[PDB]
Amino acid sequence: TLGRDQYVYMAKLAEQAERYEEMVQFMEQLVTGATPAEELTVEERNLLSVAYKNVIGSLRAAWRIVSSIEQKEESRKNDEHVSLVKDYRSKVESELSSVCSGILKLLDSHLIPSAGASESKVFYLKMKGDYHRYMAEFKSGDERKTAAEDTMLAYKAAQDIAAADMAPTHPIRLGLALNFSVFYYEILNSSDKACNMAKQAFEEAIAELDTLGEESYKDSTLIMQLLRDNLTLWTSDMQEQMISNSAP
Amino acid sequence: TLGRDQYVYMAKLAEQAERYEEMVQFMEQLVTGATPAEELTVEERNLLSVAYKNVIGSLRAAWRIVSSIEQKEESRKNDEHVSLVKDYRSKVESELSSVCSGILKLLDSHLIPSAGASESKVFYLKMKGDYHRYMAEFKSGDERKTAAEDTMLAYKAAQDIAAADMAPTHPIRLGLALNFSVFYYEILNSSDKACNMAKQAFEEAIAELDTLGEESYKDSTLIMQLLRDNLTLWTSDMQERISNSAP
Numbered sequence: 001t002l003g004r005d006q007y008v009y010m011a012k013l014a015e016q017a018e019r020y021e022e023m024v025q026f027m028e029q030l031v032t033g034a035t036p037a038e039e040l041t042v043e044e045r046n047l048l049s050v051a052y053k054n055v056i057g058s059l060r061a062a063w064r065i066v067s068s069i070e071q072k073e074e075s076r077k078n079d080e081h082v083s084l085v086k087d088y089r090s091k092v093e094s095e096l097s098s099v100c101s102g103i104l105k106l107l108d109s110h111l112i113p114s115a116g117a118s119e120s121k122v123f124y125l126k127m128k129g130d131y132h133r134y135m136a137e138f139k140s141g142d143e144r145k146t147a148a149e150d151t152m153l154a155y156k157a158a159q160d161i162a163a164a165d166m167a168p169t170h171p172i173r174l175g176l177a178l179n180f181s182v183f184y185y186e187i188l189n190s191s192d193k194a195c196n197m198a199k200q201a202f203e204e205a206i207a208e209l210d211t212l213g214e215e216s217y218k219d220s221t222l223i224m225q226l227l228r229d230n231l232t233l234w235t236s237d238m239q240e241q242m243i244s245n246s247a248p
Numbered sequence: 249t250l251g252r253d254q255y256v257y258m259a260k261l262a263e264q265a266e267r268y269e270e271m272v273q274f275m276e277q278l279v280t281g282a283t284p285a286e287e288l289t290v291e292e293r294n295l296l297s298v299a300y301k302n303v304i305g306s307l308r309a310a311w312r313i314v315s316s317i318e319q320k321e322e323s324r325k326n327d328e329h330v331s332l333v334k335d336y337r338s339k340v341e342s343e344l345s346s347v348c349s350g351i352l353k354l355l356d357s358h359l360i361p362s363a364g365a366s367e368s369k370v371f372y373l374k375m376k377g378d379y380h381r382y383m384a385e386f387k388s389g390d391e392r393k394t395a396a397e398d399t400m401l402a403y404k405a406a407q408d409i410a411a412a413d414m415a416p417t418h419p420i421r422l423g424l425a426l427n428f429s430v431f432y433y434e435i436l437n438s439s440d441k442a443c444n445m446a447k448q449a450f451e452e453a454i455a456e457l458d459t460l461g462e463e464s465y466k467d468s469t470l471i472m473q474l475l476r477d478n479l480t481l482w483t484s485d486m487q488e489r490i491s492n493s494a495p
Contacts, residue, residue: 002332009329013336016317017310062265069264084254088261 004034011047020054024102027051031106036113039120049127052103056134059096063138066092093138100131118165119172122158126176129154130246133179136187148187155180168204169212171219175247177201178227182244185230191239198227198234223247252282252292259295268306271299272350279354283362293368297375300351304382307344311386312490314340341386348379366413367420370406374424377402378493381427384435396435403428416452417460422471423494425449429475430491433482443482450475470495 002010007030014023027048031040040048066089073081107128115121129151136147158176166173177197184194205224212220226245233244250258255278262271275296279288288296318333355376363369377399384395407428410421425445433442450472460468474492481489 006332009332010336013314013317013333017313017336017340019310019340062267065265066261069261081257084250084257085261088258088265092265092267 001033002029004030007033008044008047011051015047015050018054020051020058023047023051024055028102028106031110035110039114039116040111045120045123052099052131056096056099056131059092059099060134060137063089063092063096067138096134096138100135103131104128118161119170122162122166122176123172125154125158125161126172126179129158129183130179133183133187144187148183151183151187155183167208167211168201169208169216169220171216171223174201174205174220174223174227178223178230178245178247181227181230182246185234185244188242189239190242191234191237192242195231195234198231202227202231219248249281250277252278255281256292256295259299263295263298268299268302271295272303275299276350276354279358283358285362287362287364287368288359293371300347300379304344304347304379307340307347308382308385311337311340311344315386344382344386348383351379352376366409367418370410370414370424371420373402373406373409374420374427377406377424377431378427381431381435384431399431399435403431415456416449417456417464417468419464419467419471422449422453422468422475426471426475426478426492426494430478430493433478434491439482439486443479446475446479450479 007026011023011026011030014020014026027044030044031048034040066085070082070085070089073085107124111124112121112128115124132147132151132154136144136151139147155176159180162170162173162176168174178201181194181198181201184190184197202224205220226247230244255274259271259274259278262268262274275292278292279296282288282292314333314337318330318337321329321333355372359372360369360376363372380395380399380402384392384399387395403424406424410418410424414421416422426449429442429445429449431442432438432445453468453472457465457468457472471494474494478491481491
């Protein structure tokens with residue numbers, strides 16, 4: 001076993017080598033060894049989030065490609081290749097599930113219990129909704145509806161806490177509104193609800209934009225632009241009743 | 249167990265998804281089931297080469313980064329951080345060793361025996377030397393010399409066959425001379441021999457490049473352009489980067 005400061009060094013070392021599967025292991029060991037008794041630092045909090053974002057991001061990108069090839073093979077009526085491709089996609093899906101379960105388990109057992117402030121709660125609850133949403137991207141029915149309900153619970157909990165204590169210009173609250181609006185748009189097909197949410201968070205940040213500090217102005221404004229980009233792509237598109245840019 | 253044609257489809261599928269560790273496995277099983285009784289098709293032979301190239305390239309890239317991190321830490325005399333980085337580098341080295349052994353074992357047990365033509369023999373022998381050279385990159389001391397010796401034998405064997413049966417404009421023979429010259433410059437620090445070897449291959453090829461058509465002109469000239477890129481880098485290096493190996 002290494003020290004807390006040493007796992008941060010090993011996580012960064014793995015980050016430089018783009019060996020993210022091991023960056024996750026180094027941060028998990030840091031988490032399980034310092035929480036829930038104590039709270040993660042902003043640095044450790046972001047290193048963990050970055051580690052899982054890259055690991056799952058790589059599998060999400062692969063799943064898109066495989067799923068796309070499957071549709072291309074089913075349009076050819078190539079029954080042979082369709083059988084092989086679906087075997088492969090399920091292998092990627094089991095790995096997507098493995099990673100989401102890892103962080104979701106760490107969120108319930110360690111991270112959320114460790115949050116002793118609204119900022120940390122909203123961060124981990126948002127994160128909890130994020131990886132439930134990733135589960136909902138490849139699940140079919142029932143499993144997807146369950147994945148969607150778990151997403152709704154985690155996000156709406158983070159939204160309640162954030163709106164009451166977080167500032168509308170805080171990147172975490174902004175990122176929450178972004179990913180939450182992506183949830184309505186891409187998981188629930190509610191363009192109207194998703195646009196109304198993104199716009200509200202955007203305008204709320206504009207009103208208090210003067211009181212935005214050096215530390216988080218780029219993080220905030222970046223999310224603000226992603227909200228505006230999505231809102232343009234969504235309003236440019238046209239739904240009927242009821243990829244998008246998620247947070248950094 | 250799947251069929252030969254299907255392993256090709258799965259290897260191609262893994263390549264599209266950029267899941268190269270699996271692309272290797274699909275081809276490994278294709279090889280162990282089809283050879284040495286028969287020989288790999290050019291397609292299969294290339295799918296195998298690409299799969300291992302990406303896997304070992306990814307680790308070689310990480311090893312350069314980690315190895316670079318270690319040096320800086322030592323320059324500051326952190327001591328603690330230094331011991332941590334080496335333990336991490338040694339983990340990447342064990343993986344590099346695992347990959348190379350995988351293809352090297354596949355070469356000596358299945359692929360080289362299957363080669364019933366000089367072109368294939370030189371392709372598989374040139375590959376054997378490539379992955380012994382990758383061992384020599386991170387090995388040190390006693391283990392390094394053994395790796396450098398194994399590289400010399402694979403390349404020299406491929407060169408003997410190539411110079412006798414392959415044309416000096418053939419991309420495989422040009423790539424061999426390219427990687428074989430990089431071996432002398434990077435591993436053995438023989439700046440002169442690496443240059444003499446590169447120039448010879450580039451001279452022997454241009455002397456026959458006129459009679460070469462536009463079908464493989466891009467193939468030959470591309471490796472030729474790499475032979476001179478290294479040869480320009482090396483000359484400037486003697487005016488006191490990583491050499492361009494073959495595609």
